[PDB]
Symmetry: D2
Subunit: 282 residues, 4 copies
């Protein structure tokens, strides 16, 4: 079943401005209510897709946003203009998070520019579909882990110096961690690592008053998709879930708002499943 136009992109991270149709990253009807007023946020991969929607929604809730991303300057710039439109501060932090030192630098830079750090959203990811395990090279395996899970370790480790009672960490996992994906074996393994990391870290930081939770999206129309899958696969993206459609990035943002604010003060170690109705024994 065809859900989107057939399309593919040469390189990854994907570029949102090349997508047809453009992901819906903002809900026009969304009304902010100061849920994150004055909070300082760092978001990895906040330039496009889900991260773009989360940055914009956080801004509408009064948060100042530092956005880390690889090199998609056009996308990062567009996200920044939407964020600043809400009258909050926005800081752009380009660079390769597969490098430990850079993971430390983005936290240091966030604190320098915003004054402090309250909420960290680990959201960066890359994915390289392959027809079977025999087609996953050592080079691809390690690249996939270094960006998808090691960056979450290093960035969070560096943020711990700055987080205090009342602060929050949110990790973007994926439905593939729960359900498996035969063409994304290494990627699913990194998302499964993120789930266990979220559980373990929540127990580690609970007595420090820092909450740790995750969001597990299903198929969401974002740049990650046409940049990883073939056209035919892209054209059918989202037809498999019970709502029979891919999710739009704005549909993920309120889950992050919920987890980031005092609204979830009694929530830690959990996962919010936003996936069109796929039952995962959640």
């Amino acid at each position: 079943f065809v859900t989107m136009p057939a399309q593919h992109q040469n390189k990854q991270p994907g570029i949102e401005s090349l997508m047809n149709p453009l992901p819906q990253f903002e809900d026009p009807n969304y009304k902010g209510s100061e849920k994150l007023k004055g909070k300082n946020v760092l978001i990895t991969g906040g330039d496009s897709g889900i991260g773009r929607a989360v940055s914009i929604a956080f801004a509408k809730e009064g948060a100042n946003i530092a956005i880390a991303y690889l090199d998609e300057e056009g996308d990062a710039n567009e996200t920044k203009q939407y964020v600043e439109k809400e009258g909050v501060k926005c800081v752009l932090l380009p660079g390769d998070l597969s490098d430990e030192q850079h993971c430390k630098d983005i936290v240091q830079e966030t604190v320098r520019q915003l004054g402090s750090l309250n909420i960290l959203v680990n959201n960066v990811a890359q994915q390289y579909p392959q027809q079977g395990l025999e087609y996953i090279t050592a080079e691809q395996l390690e690249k996939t882990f270094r960006i998808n899970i090691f960056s979450y370790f290093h960035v969070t480790k560096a943020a711990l110096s700055h987080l205090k009672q009342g602060d929050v960490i949110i990790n973007t996992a994926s439905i593939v961690a729960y359900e498996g994906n035969e063409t994304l074996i290494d990627y699913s393994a990194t998302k499964g690592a993120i789930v266990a990391f979220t559980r373990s870290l929540s127990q580690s930081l609970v007595q420090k008053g820092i909450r740790v939770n995750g969001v597990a999206p299903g198929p969401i129309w974002t740049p990650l998709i046409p940049s990883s899958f073939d056209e035919k696969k892209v054209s059918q993206f989202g037809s498999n879930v019970p709502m029979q459609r891919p999710g739009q990035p704005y549909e993920l943002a309120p889950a992050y708002v919920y987890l980031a604010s005092s609204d979830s003060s009694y929530v830690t170690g959990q996962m919010i499943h936003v996936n069109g109705g796929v039952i995962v024994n959640g």
Copy 2:
């Protein structure tokens, strides 16, 4: 195990909130509504106290009209009504026994008569009778527990279906005990496991009609259910075993329900939101 609350007990269940010390915090003063549920017509079973009270009030702050079903706690229901009506929305009180199938049908009929329609159903009524082991659960207790905890959810929802359309929503209150078990509430836990599966199954049934079905699994929350079911000693240490080392307050549950009841969760169905102080449940 350690003290979290004052030793207290109520000799009748459903419990009366006005008799609690400290009174549960059912409202967050800092909560700012933003029309998330503007003009929506809601039916909440057990919306007179505890979590249901906090949900009724938060929904009112979001602009929803609220029909509250409850057994017989008029004092608690009238108090809840005062807070709902403070928000300028309509509140309808529906007392009566939801262990009676006909009464489950009547509350839906009455909600539609008074509010004009029904958009969001929150199944939330429950009773619990702790026992030291299975051998202390009579057939009478087993049946009573299931009739109110899960059969009412079936009967009320069933009646609600002819009134729900595309964009409507159902939320079911389950419990952490469905996921983690509780050796002293074996029948009760079984009812909560039934709700979890009911939620999963009904979500798949209604997805093509555009009706979402989700749940909330609370951990230990300070509500009338606690002193009315547990003994004084266990009450005094309630919530001490969870990683945050305190029971939750009812106002801490309301936002999960708001999320699930509004367009904010448009891509969410068949799911459970665990609000339990940090207990990992492989969620």
Copy 3:
């Protein structure tokens, strides 16, 4: 099309009427005295999964008391396979939706076998509906009474007789984990069983009694043509990654594992035997 299109106008179904006959026994299954001299009570042990379990348990040396509703022909056949193994077999017909009969099958099991070591709660009925609005109160209560209340009553009666080293196994279902839109009440009963297994495990762990469950996926049994329509029956089990329904004999080793001392460090768990459906297990 996985199976021949068929339907039975009565439930519980009769295995002897099915085409093909489910494979309830594995020719190569070799016993190794895993349950030698153990006294077992299995509810719904006359056919389908229950019959496979009775036979495998007999091959492991256990004496089997089989409770079933009224399928004398199916119960008699199961009894012949059990007795072929040189162990004792007791047939206990009757309706387990009645509390007193649940107590009676336990008493009768202890009378005939001398004691009770392993209880397998496995009885079930299912009535598919196109929606919730087609489930009567009669169907709802009957489904719960047999599917979960019998599990409470039989198990409760068994507690006087179980000691350190004894075991309880509850048959749940994949539907408790994944949901089933056509079986909403049945699914709720199976979710009840999962929580019941979890809670009871923690209640009995200090008494040395283990409690675990099995969650089968689509299994070719008399429950299938007796409940589902003929074109659903013909497509049965095509929805799982193994693209076939399971045979009852494929369920039996999971029960052997959970019943014997091979699972001495396992309580409160579920073994998922479902053709590869991932359930976040």
Copy 4:
């Protein structure tokens, strides 16, 4: 918490089993084999001690020839070879470092060369380095922990694929910590979560080739990994926290692996067997 074992600790990791008091029990003398692995050749990583030794021996009793890959615990490996061959099967020892990709490939090649074929792969190697928090986990430790705990499972399995056919089987040792989390083993836990997802995805990838892929999730088992990774008092209380109030013995894990390795589990793929002393994990 309370004392379950003697206070003890070992200088290096991987640990040495012959140093432990009491010696783990790796065999159940009452366990009788019944040819459940008739004519099969197995490769077990980490099969020299702890759970891996218990599995090696049980597999031998079921009729399997066993190739055991391990790091450098020659004493433990040789003792294990002795137990295996005593059951009337062949045993091949494959020492070396599985954090190296090429070595992962070589152990598979050597197994086929010496045994003739490969039918069952059991990925079971691990290392763990407890730390009081995330700030105490260096990049060096993070990468080392991943390279051996999960990348080795990728490389060994990948190399094994050209040798596996319909009816063959993969089993991956995960851990309760992927489900419950562990605050002193944040990196280890993450490798275990990766194993759970690897198992799920790989089961779906190989199901049409007729190869099943499942996992075992142990709870606290008395093995050389414990005294070599934890401090003395921690070791002394090992297992006190699960409902059975004791750690498991390695022989208590073997039958789960036998179940998954044999045609007894022909209708099982993509699953986990939780052998943990009663910890509820929403399984």
